[PDB]
Design a protein around this nucleic acid. Structure first.
Lengths: 149, 50, 177, 84, 188, 136
RNA sequence: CGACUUACCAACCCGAUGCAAACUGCGAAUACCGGAGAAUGUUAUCACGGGAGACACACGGCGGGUGCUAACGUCCGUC
RNA sequence: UCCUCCUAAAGAGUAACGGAGGAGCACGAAGGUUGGCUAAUCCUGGUCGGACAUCAGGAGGUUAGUGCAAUGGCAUAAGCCAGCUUGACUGCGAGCGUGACGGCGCGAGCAGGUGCGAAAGCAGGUCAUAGUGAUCCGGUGGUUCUGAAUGGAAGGGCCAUC
RNA sequence: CCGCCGCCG
RNA sequence: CGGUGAUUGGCGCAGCCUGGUAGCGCACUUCGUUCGGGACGAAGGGGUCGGAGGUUCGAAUCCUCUAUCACCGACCA
């Protein structure tokens, strides 16, 4: 409907329908995140079944992946939202920003990833909440941080 | 049963808070209403919490 | 605007004598021309309506208004407030222009043409025809359409009977089967 | 002595009565704020110097005597107060 | 928190006791003279789940939670754990090998299967009535002598085994049933 | 038994039988059967008084029925104690006030109509009498 | 692809006829609340403070529910 | 237990294992305010199109609608849509209505602080009545109010609240 | 591996 | 007498709980296989939920009334 021409103002390039399912069948890695809305949830749930999620492209009411606010989704989610994925172990690796940014803000960005990961205390946690938290740059630095401060 | 309750924490320095009910499984985003504060006597925007 | 000035002093003098009118405001003039497109099969996809709403952008000179459903029935699996059709209401200046383009270069393009039925009157004087193709209008490029379903044209006048409005269309030669 | 079985009754439910109705009648001097008519819908509408609560409760907004009218094109009952 | 005495739960009402939560299939009601009434409640286990039989008296109640059964859609396999998908709210779900036992072969992709939802997330998975599958390990069956019915074993693409007739040898997709596990027809 | 179709409710109150009647005069037919006693007529009693009256007017003619029961009467079953709810609907009565015309008839002689309502008044519990359609 | 014939049932309306606790385009008698006045009555009024008894009622007149327009039956109103 | 109607006898109240239905909610718009609008169902005409999609016209009159039963109610609309918004705000509240009481319900207006409208004005929830339970104990946040010699804290108090 | 019987003169 | 849960294709049974779809196994029909039949393979047909009335945009499902048929049985004297 109108959201196929109103979500284009939020910064997305390829907005549409089952014509984008042919790009799923080709296995295009140009996209990394999939965002939809609850009216085209019959597209991904019936065509992008296996390739979407070891594809790991997300479409959840658990997360805010599919709201009906598709105009105001990618005004900040295309800009600064980094998605939390599960692992088989203890680890949840995320991504830090460009090296020449304000380093005082990133140390508060790491401090405000604490309130987001402790916002869900799954209530069946074990002994600790966070044991080891280390922020490396790409492949060289090793910076052991703390879970309390 | 379905409609649980939330806590509107004031974003100002006071510890005053309003409380209300919000159905999480329909509109899962937070509320950013703008009501009166009886401590600061301002019109501070309130934020959603538990 | 061509056959608007033709209405002013050739069609009025034709009509003031046939039904003995005593005032110049007594003659019926056409008020509006309403173009409905009852698409109906928009229960499958929304983009079928958006292709159909773009088809009225070439026949008319403006954007159609989609119509929500009035009632909700069981024989069609429709719901309350559903875009089951889109309409075009055109009046004022372009209603003479669409009527110029209809009876001259769109009505003779009807496939298997014999004429228009004079039984399509409701007793008020509001004629309603029905077209069955998009390819009778010159703006459709014959390749963008994918459905045989056409539309209907309602010509609403300010008359009171059918004979009062039949001679109104008779001056525009209105092929009269 | 034989005793046959007995049935049941699905009914037997009623409410607390809400004490609706006219409280102050006509020509009766009232104070400001007194309830005049408690009612579900506006059987009586509010006239001059009489308000209408959220419960459709007609309350006095001034001192004086309760007055009943039959005013209006729809022949409805208003309640006014002549300010005394 | 709900309560259900023996005069309340009669058919399709889950009860919770110690656990695991059970399900009532059918029950009778006896109200005998001199003594208290009872009910031969033929319960059904849900987790293992074979059967349990109890004769509840007029006392006492039992917690009824949870009941929820709904249509899902299988789409994903990774290592051990599986997932499903809704069509009325489009919410994710996680499955286990405990919920799939003696059923994991038949469901392959986009099946309209049902699960039983109880406190995170399933208990068991019920496969649909008909799924389409393909044989890959099957001999090029000769006619033989053969003077009757038979009929060769076929190793299936999911790891199962079915008995197929002679006319399907290599790469023939077929639909079967999941209640008993026999051949019925071939899709064409 | 003349029984209604989809009534508003199944059971109603007992109700008194006070007041007089409204159908005083005979309107349609030539002669009528006016009731004098204050009682009630069950749904079998109208149909039983019609069988003993349609015969004696030999079948050509036309017969009206100016009453209709539409009032349920409950009855408890055999050996049932008091209380424990309201009974079950068994039959339908018409509250017949004094002055009510029951039947009407047209196309018969006066001698044939006199020996017709006499053969129907004995089928009724209420005291009735013979009348004539008065002008205006 | 065309259907004609047509002892039979029947809607919305027109005209007439009835019925209803859970129908109201009409509408009393009493009761009830508010003011004024006359006569009468050991303040019969209301507000406090001390002390109880009682909370199993029954019959009849009227107005009803229920029961079989049965009961010295049962359940309410009022005397 | 609570709500609607009748029984209930023209104020109110009024019982029975008397006649009938519903509730243990929903909503950040379905609230506030400003502006604009008036249905049901038949009839005629009309592409696919039919008893019923949308369009055009009339009869018709609120028989429609009101998040949900039932009565009462509403056209100045409380019915419907849109723009803009959070008054679903804090401290009070003369007064009465209803209850044995615990309690419940209406509340003009004042003070501070906003919303909408040019302005008069309106808003301390939704057309109204059902959607809910007293205390004790226990948990979170705030406030030197107390704090067992003193200075602190623990634990209590107040307030918001589970 | 599997392969039952074939109405009465 | 009361109470409770059923009736769904010729038959036996699901589905109802938590509403937009009526199935499954035989039986039946046709073909292939056999000298023919049974059995086995291939293709296909068959009802629209006991009846009636509500609720609702929509009812086999959710409620109500009877109709029909099983099981619980008529306790203390």
């Amino acid at each position: 409907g109108a959201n196929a021409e109103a979500a284009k103002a939020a910064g997305a390039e390829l907005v549409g329908m089952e014509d984008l399912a042919d790009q799923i069948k080709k296995g295009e890695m140009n996209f990394d995140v999939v965002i939809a809305s609850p009216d085209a949830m019959r597209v991904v749930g019936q065509l992008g079944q296996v390739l979407g999620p070891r594809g790991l492209m997300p479409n959840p009411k658990v997360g805010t992946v599919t709201p009906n606010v598709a105009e105001a989704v990618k005004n900040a989610k295309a800009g600064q939202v980094r998605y939390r994925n599960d692992k088989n172990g203890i680890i949840h690796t995320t991504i830090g920003k460009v090296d020449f940014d304000a380093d005082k803000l990133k140390e508060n960005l790491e401090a405000l990833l604490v309130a987001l990961k402790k916002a869900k205390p799954t209530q069946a946690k074990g002994v600790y909440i966070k044991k080891v938290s280390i922020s490396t740059t790409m492949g060289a630095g090793v910076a052991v941080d703390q879970a309390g401060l | 049963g379905i409609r649980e309750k939330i806590k509107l924490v004031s974003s100002a320095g006071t510890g005053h808070f309003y409380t209300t009910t919000k159905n999480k499984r329909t509109k899962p985003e937070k509320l950013e209403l703008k009501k009166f504060d009886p401590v600061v006597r301002q019109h501070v925007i309130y934020k959603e919490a538990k | 605007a061509k056959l608007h000035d033709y209405y002013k002093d050739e069609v009025v003098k034709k009509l003031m004598t046939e039904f003995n009118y005593n005032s110049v405001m007594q003659v019926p003039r056409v008020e509006k021309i309403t173009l409905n497109m009852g698409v109906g099969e928009a229960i499958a996809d929304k983009k079928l309506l958006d292709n159909a709403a773009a088809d009225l952008a070439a026949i008319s000179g403006q954007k159609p208004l989609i119509t929500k459903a009035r009632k909700s029935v069981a024989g069609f699996k429709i719901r309350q407030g559903y875009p089951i059709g889109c309409k075009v209401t055109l009046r004022g200046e372009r209603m003479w222009e669409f009527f110029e383009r209809l009876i001259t270069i769109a009505v003779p393009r009807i496939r298997d043409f014999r004429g228009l039925s004079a039984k399509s009157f409701d007793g008020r004087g509001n004629y309603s025809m029905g077209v069955r193709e998009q390819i009778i209008f010159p703006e459709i490029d014959y390749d963008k359409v994918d459905r045989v379903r056409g539309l209907d044209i309602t010509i609403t006048t300010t008359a009171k009977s059918d004979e009062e409005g039949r001679a109104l269309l008779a001056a525009f030669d209105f092929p009269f089967r | 002595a034989h005793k046959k079985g007995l049935g049941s009754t699905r009914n037997g439910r009623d409410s607390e009565a809400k004490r609706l109705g006219v409280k102050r009648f006509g020509g009766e001097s009232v104070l400001a704020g007194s309830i005049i008519v408690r009612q579900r819908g506006t059987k009586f509408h509010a006239g001059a110097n009489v308000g209408c609560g959220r419960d459709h409760t007609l309350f006095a907004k001034a001192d004086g005597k309760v007055k009943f009218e039959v005013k209006g094109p729809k022949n409805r009952k208003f309640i006014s107060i002549e300010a005394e | 928190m709900a309560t259900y005495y023996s005069n309340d739960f009669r058919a399709g009402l889950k009860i919770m006791l110690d656990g695991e939560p059970y399900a009532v299939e059918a029950s009778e009601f006896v109200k005998p003279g001199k003594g208290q009434a009872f009910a031969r409640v033929k319960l059904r286990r849900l987790l293992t789940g074979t059967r349990v039989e109890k004769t509840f008296k007029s006392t006492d109640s039992a917690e009824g939670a949870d009941v929820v059964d709904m249509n899902l859609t299988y789409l994903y396999n990774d290592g051990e754990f599986w997932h499903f998908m809704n069509n009325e709210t489009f919410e994710q779900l996680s499955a286990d090998a405990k919920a799939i036992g003696d059923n994991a072969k038949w469901l392959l992709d986009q099946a309209e299967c049902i699960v039983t939802l109880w406190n995170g997330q399933p208990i068991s998975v019920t496969p649909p009535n008909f799924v389409e599958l393909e044989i890959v390990d099957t001999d090029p069956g000769l006619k033989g002598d053969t003077a009757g019915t038979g009929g060769k074993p076929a190793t299936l693409s999911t790891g199962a085994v079915v008995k197929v007739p002679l006319f399907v040898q290599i790469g023939e997709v077929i639909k079967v049933d999941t209640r008993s596990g026999e051949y019925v027809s071939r899709v064409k | 038994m003349l029984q209604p179709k989809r009534t508003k409710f199944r059971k109603m109150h007992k109700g008194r039988n006070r007041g007089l009647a409204q159908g005083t005069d005979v309107s349609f037919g030539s002669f009528g059967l006016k009731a004098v006693g204050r009682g009630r007529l069950t749904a079998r009693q109208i149909e039983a008084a019609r069988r003993a009256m349609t015969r004696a007017v030999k079948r050509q003619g036309k017969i009206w029925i100016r009453v209709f029961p539409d009032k349920p009467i409950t009855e408890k079953p055999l050996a049932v104690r008091m209380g424990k709810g309201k009974g079950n609907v068994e039959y339908w009565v018409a509250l017949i006030q004094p002055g009510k015309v029951l039947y009407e008839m047209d196309g018969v002689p006066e001698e044939l109509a006199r020996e017709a309502f006499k053969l129907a008044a004995a089928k009724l519990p209420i005291k009735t009498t013979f009348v004539t359609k008065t002008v205006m």
